[PDB]
Structure 1
Amino acid sequence: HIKEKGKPLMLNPRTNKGMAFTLQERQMLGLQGLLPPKIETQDIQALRFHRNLKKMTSPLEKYIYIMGIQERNEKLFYRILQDDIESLMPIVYTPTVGLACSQYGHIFRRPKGLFISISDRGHVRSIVDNWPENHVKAVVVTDGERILGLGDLGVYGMGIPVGKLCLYTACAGIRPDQCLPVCIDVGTDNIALLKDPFYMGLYQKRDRTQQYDDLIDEFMKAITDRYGRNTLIQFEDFGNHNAFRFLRKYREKYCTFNDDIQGTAAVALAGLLAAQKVISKPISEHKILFLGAGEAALGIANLIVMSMVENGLSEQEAQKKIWMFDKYGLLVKGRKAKIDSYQEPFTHSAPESIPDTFEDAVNILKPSTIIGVAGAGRLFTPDVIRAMASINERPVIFALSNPTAQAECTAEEAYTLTEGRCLFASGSPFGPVKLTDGRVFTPGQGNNVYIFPGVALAVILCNTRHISDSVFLEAAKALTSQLTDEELAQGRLYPPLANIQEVSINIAIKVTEYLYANKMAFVYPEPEDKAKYVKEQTWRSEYDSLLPDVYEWP
């Protein structure tokens, strides 16, 4: 392997080992003299990194440093991430990745990923053909319209697919060279970016004409034409309107899913499932109120229904336990604000009185669970939280909007205002909370990073062609089944983040077993031990020998 020799082996982060290149590799591959005499181990290199990181102060500075390593020594980059994924997650992922995107054009050094603009319409294939890797298996694509809860960040949104894919590898051991981050640039409506001299995209408002849909269509076709019709394509951070219609339009034709609708749905469900274990509350007494009625809300709601239905409840009965409150208020039949086909099943006859605020909604409906997915800030006010604590003995409060500043409420607020009776989870990380009575609560992170890595690995290994909703239901069950009784008592609704790697692999195994049982896997020969197969297929951050095969002839 490795056709290149000389300087090019050092210039390419995929092969570059720095001083880890052995003496023999250096002499045989023409590197002797190009590196200091010192021969180092990956351990020493990782030590050098941690030593430097410790001296840094701002999260963004740390983000620039670690992400920079991905462009110098890929193996080391993942070794570093794997050394302590929990402490680096907030840096490479939410919330810092949100900060990085808002200033993407200012911290730019080297480009990452594939960029496809509306000005390239009709020539996307040639762009796809310029990507250096021939064996792409997974794609995470965004158009930058709904970056987390930050809004339209245009091409600055590329930091998201890059980050997601980094996690594909770090969490599920998916091969880096088989991952392709993609940014579709059709312009941006963010006035600030349009006047930013460092903006990385086209200086035009978003093209919302038929050319937009045609470009996306060309994208889907170009990607599958070169890499295969089963190439995994994960849509990420697309605006509400486009997110749904593209999922419906392509889910039966391509191997695709939307992380914000389906991935977030699975993590949220998983958390709810864990809470049900600690509370043992009757599915009939469940009253769920959503703050928001978009990608996440509808995604989570539908998965919840699927769960209730396979648990002895009719689809209609299940849907009736779910209410939604968007920017215009409670979704009730006959309201002024629009209601599409997706929201209809959750739009019920108006209650006795109509609420004006989410607080009114909580007091009127008396929900047992409250889920925040509006990406609009601290909407779960202290009064909202108190109401939930007065109405329920153990209220379930989920503040899922990212990044942190967009979260509906903090762990501190939830645990304190509910006297430690709530079951809380958030999308962005919060440290443990200690109440005056000495009890310490460790908030879980209901973020899709717990789901897309394992699901991606299973789909890829099984050569799955299409992803049904039932696949996410299974992932949700696979995630929650990994929680130990001790962890439940700790108030943890999700396995510890420090164990994300093994958790993701286990989810992968559980999903592959599900795919095979339901004829959705197409690999030959079919491995007898699915668990062993998945584990044997994972990419390792350990250095590989680049030495040519030299041997004696008799």
Structure 2
Amino acid sequence: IKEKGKPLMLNPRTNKGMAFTLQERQMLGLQGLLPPKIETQDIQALRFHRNLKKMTSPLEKYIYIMGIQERNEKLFYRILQDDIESLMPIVYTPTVGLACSQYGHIFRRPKGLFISISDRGHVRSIVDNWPENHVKAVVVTDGERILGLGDLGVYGMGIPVGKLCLYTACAGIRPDRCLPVCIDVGTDNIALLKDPFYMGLYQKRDRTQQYDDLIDEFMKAITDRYGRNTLIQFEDFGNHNAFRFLRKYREKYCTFNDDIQGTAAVALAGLLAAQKVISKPISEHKILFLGAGEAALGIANLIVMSMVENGLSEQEAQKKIWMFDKYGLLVKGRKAKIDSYQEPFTHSAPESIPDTFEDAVNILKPSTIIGVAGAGRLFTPDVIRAMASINERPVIFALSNPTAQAECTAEEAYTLTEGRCLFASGSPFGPVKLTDGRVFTPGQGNNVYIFPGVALAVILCNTRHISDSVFLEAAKALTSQLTDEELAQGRLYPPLANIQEVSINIAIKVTEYLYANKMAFRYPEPEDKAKYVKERTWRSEYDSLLPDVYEWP
């Protein structure tokens, strides 16, 4: 490091608290500024869990652990490392959504960059204000579609912050190379415009061309200072902007959209694991989505790429996918609109026009149901029963987040199908024991299983662009890690407790894929991709800060 003395303690990237050794204190001007006691990171972790055990609400736990990231970075991650499964719900979905809807009530310190429409023309100067000189990964949101909570404006900064925590906790990406970003062009949230604690501009969203220019100016500014190959992950943008920005920049920068592409991969991985148990002919596979937005289209497009890779033409596969949105079933010539992306899955109206999602299930008789509407408990008991009656082993994915917007619970899916369904959800649910002793451990179909591993691979290989093919390879890399014993439990995904090793493995597989397809530019090409990746992961163990002292001959 460059500085010594108090500054070392005030900066969380370097502060170690009482873990600063005696020599470090004396040589770096800290003696007397710390209590006489010398501690280990282990003692500090104990302090943490000791106090966490006594806390009552998830939000309170969020504020506390999240505060550690602003005081002692190394320890913050040592804490996540100790038990990522139990803390995931706190730092990530669903509690992060809770934090976001209340971001202005719990604010203590800011985190990340805020670029508003009012800064148009001066974005580059905002990017130069960021302290870190070598940013490799950016996660950006404009806060219009925060989880299934809708438009939360700048209160959505909570999402990019959470995603990045996982870049480091899951894939070992250096936190100092990560930058959370929030684009504030206003918010249509009437309640927030009336909140005296709101953190953004008090104006409705700017949807004119100035908005696209702002985004343009941001992509330009970020790459100018950090590099053309800086990984830019779009997160929680509205439906229209999400697809547009993805297609406008995907071939120009090293960018992707988590909601559209990372989701697609995790979902596909779940369906793959499922096919392992079901083993049914793909000619008998009929899928039906509740909702036809970002994730539905992304999932459907990757399912098609999977089916095509498996024989069917692109046109035959798309006919095997249906969608049901807020206006009803997506069929040709319906009163409600249908965008360019939905058309491919908009088919000739069947015998009857289903009025409810239930009718749709009975009429179309799908074998797989995927909920991604973010509208609540729409996979009603009748839907689940209809599914269990129609299929011996129905696949039921309720992916909407947070928990209250989920289509159904694990407990509802398993009991209403007598333990026959193959379930996955976006938000966490604990094990389910049926009235007959059978225990079913549900898996979490959440994009966190993908973006960390993919991001690591892309950064390490100096990749310039990300094609949909990477996510397909990621899908296969995730489900390829499922053992048969975990399959028996009802797990369509590796245990969340192993998310770190699982992410690394996905990173290794994707790096092998990028190189083999001339998508990597990090020369020389590593001989052992496995040893290469593992060798470059950031660790939470304290580094010695002592200067290099030695005797001259």
SS of the aligned residue for 2:521 comes to coil
Whole-Å Cα distance in 2 between the matches of residues 199 and 39 of structure 1?
A: 42
C-alpha deviation, 1:345, in angstroms: 1.0
C-alpha deviation, 1:450, in angstroms: 0.1
Report percent identity of matched pairs.
Answer: 99
SS of the aligned residue for 2:370 comes to strand
Counterpart in the other structure of 2:233: 234
Whole-Å Cα distance in 1 between the matches of residues 142 and 117 of structure 2?
A: 11
C-alpha deviation, 1:526, in angstroms: 1.5
C-alpha deviation, 1:139, in angstroms: 0.3
Whole-Å Cα distance in 2 between the matches of residues 132 and 164 of structure 1?
A: 20
Counterpart in the other structure of 2:39: 40
SS of the aligned residue for 1:149 comes to helix
Whole-Å Cα distance in 2 between the matches of residues 166 and 124 of structure 1?
A: 25
Counterpart in the other structure of 2:332: 333
2:304 is the counterpart of 1:293: no
C-alpha deviation, 1:34, in angstroms: 0.1
C-alpha deviation, 1:313, in angstroms: 1.1
SS of the aligned residue for 2:397 comes to strand
Deviations 1:372-407, CA, capped at 9 Å, x for gaps: 000111110111111001111111000000000000
C-alpha deviation, 1:124, in angstroms: 0.3
SS of the aligned residue for 1:100 comes to helix
Whole-Å Cα distance in 1 between the matches of residues 338 and 547 of structure 2?
A: 64
Whole-Å Cα distance in 1 between the matches of residues 378 and 112 of structure 2?
A: 35
Using the size of structure 2 for normalisation, the TM-score is 1.00
What stretches of structure 1 of length at least 5 have no aligned partner?
Answer: none
C-alpha deviation, 1:497, in angstroms: 0.1
Of stretches 58-67 and 329-338 in structure 1, the one that deviates more from structure 2 is: 329-338
C-alpha deviation, 1:508, in angstroms: 0.2
C-alpha deviation, 1:340, in angstroms: 1.4
C-alpha deviation, 1:225, in angstroms: 0.4
Counterpart in the other structure of 2:316: 317
C-alpha deviation, 1:525, in angstroms: 1.7
Deviations 1:433-487, CA, capped at 9 Å, x for gaps: 0001110000000000000000000000000000000000000000000000001
Using the size of structure 1 for normalisation, the TM-score is 1.00
Deviations 1:183-223, CA, capped at 9 Å, x for gaps: 00000000110000000000000001111000000000000
Whole-Å Cα distance in 1 between the matches of residues 312 and 78 of structure 2?
A: 47
C-alpha deviation, 1:341, in angstroms: 1.4
C-alpha deviation, 1:312, in angstroms: 1.1
C-alpha deviation, 1:335, in angstroms: 0.8
C-alpha deviation, 1:524, in angstroms: 1.5
Counterpart in the other structure of 1:54: 53
Deviations 1:304-348, CA, capped at 9 Å, x for gaps: 000011111111111111000011111111111111111111111
Aligned length: 553
Whole-Å Cα distance in 2 between the matches of residues 344 and 471 of structure 1?
A: 25
Moved over 6 A (4+): none
Counterpart in the other structure of 1:190: 189
Whole-Å Cα distance in 2 between the matches of residues 475 and 527 of structure 1?
A: 20
C-alpha deviation, 1:50, in angstroms: 0.5
C-alpha deviation, 1:176, in angstroms: 0.3
1:64-79 correspondence runs (5 A)? 64-79=63-78
Whole-Å Cα distance in 2 between the matches of residues 281 and 135 of structure 1?
A: 49
Whole-Å Cα distance in 1 between the matches of residues 369 and 390 of structure 2?
A: 12
SS of the aligned residue for 2:180 comes to strand
Whole-Å Cα distance in 2 between the matches of residues 118 and 316 of structure 1?
A: 42
Deviations 1:233-252, CA, capped at 9 Å, x for gaps: 00000000000000000000
Deviations 1:126-182, CA, capped at 9 Å, x for gaps: 000000000000000000000000000000000000000000000000000000000
Whole-Å Cα distance in 1 between the matches of residues 202 and 293 of structure 2?
A: 29
Deviations 1:496-532, CA, capped at 9 Å, x for gaps: 0000000000000000000000000000221111110
Counterpart in the other structure of 2:153: 154
Whole-Å Cα distance in 2 between the matches of residues 274 and 338 of structure 1?
A: 35
Whole-Å Cα distance in 2 between the matches of residues 241 and 320 of structure 1?
A: 24
Whole-Å Cα distance in 2 between the matches of residues 199 and 147 of structure 1?
A: 16
Counterpart in the other structure of 1:179: 178
C-alpha deviation, 1:271, in angstroms: 0.2
Whole-Å Cα distance in 1 between the matches of residues 161 and 442 of structure 2?
A: 27
